[PDB]
């Protein structure tokens, strides 16, 4: 349930420490980013001397919410923080290595991302 002005942690190498979400995309006029949605964020805090400068406008996909994802098993999933992964407009992650768990719900639109994951839920 990411929405504009929400702050996020980044899940990969890409050298952004923190993102502020400004827009949800592809959802038409929706206000809610949930897992698997592309958001336009900006960089707030960066990891120094990295290809990414703060105050950059970038795309990222939301891989973790504190809201709850519902599969068809009746299974539910809730993380402790919000996080996204910074991508290209191709679906390829800019940074090459991902932290944290992800879901099998991303397997359709993003292959790379499920691949680089340390754990899958």
């Amino acid at each position: 349930m990411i929405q504009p002005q929400t702050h996020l942690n980044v899940a990969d190498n890409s050298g952004a420490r923190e993102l502020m979400c400004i827009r949800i995309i592809g959802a038409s006029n929706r206000r809610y980013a949930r897992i698997g949605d592309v958001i336009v964020a900006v960089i707030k805090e960066a990891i120094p001397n990295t290809p990414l400068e703060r105050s950059e406008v970038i795309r990222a996909v939301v891989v973790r919410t504190c809201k709850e994802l519902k599969r068809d098993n009746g299974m539910i999933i809730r993380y402790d923080d919000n996080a996204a992964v910074i991508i290209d407009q191709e679906g390829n992650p800019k940074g090459t290595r991902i932290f944290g768990a992800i879901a099998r719900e991303l397997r359709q639109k993003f292959a790379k991302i499920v691949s680089l994951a340390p754990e899958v839920l």
Partner: protein
């Protein structure tokens, strides 16, 4: 011959005996460290293994629910399993923790140490 309120309760008891027949379900309470094995609709090869502590158990009928908390790669994950689900294969109690509540929701605000397993 069955009166109606009876019908509503009865259908749950039928469902649960029907499900406990195929797959007997363990005595499972709050504060129980637990290992679960899911049959995922994708990957026939390996049935997913979720470890973790039980923070809550909501009893209702066929849909009785268990909430497993675990720290994974530094990110706290809680998962909610319907207990009688066909997609669960094996479930067992690894260990038992001594707890004074019915729901440990306070495990979010505590340190990661307490959610760390395996």
């Amino acid at each position: 011959r069955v009166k109606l309120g009876d019908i509503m309760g009865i259908l749950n008891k039928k469902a649960v005996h029907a499900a406990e027949e195929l797959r007997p379900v363990p005595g499972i309470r709050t504060g129980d460290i637990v290992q679960i094995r899911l049959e995922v609709p994708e990957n026939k090869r390996r049935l997913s293994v979720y470890k973790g502590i039980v923070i809550s158990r909501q009893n209702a009928g066929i849909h009785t629910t268990i909430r497993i908390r675990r720290i994974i790669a530094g990110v706290g994950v809680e998962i909610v399993f319907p207990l009688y689900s066909p997609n669960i294969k094996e479930i067992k109690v690894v260990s038992h923790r001594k707890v004074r509540k019915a729901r440990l929701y306070y495990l979010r605000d505590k340190l990661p140490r307490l959610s760390t397993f395996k």
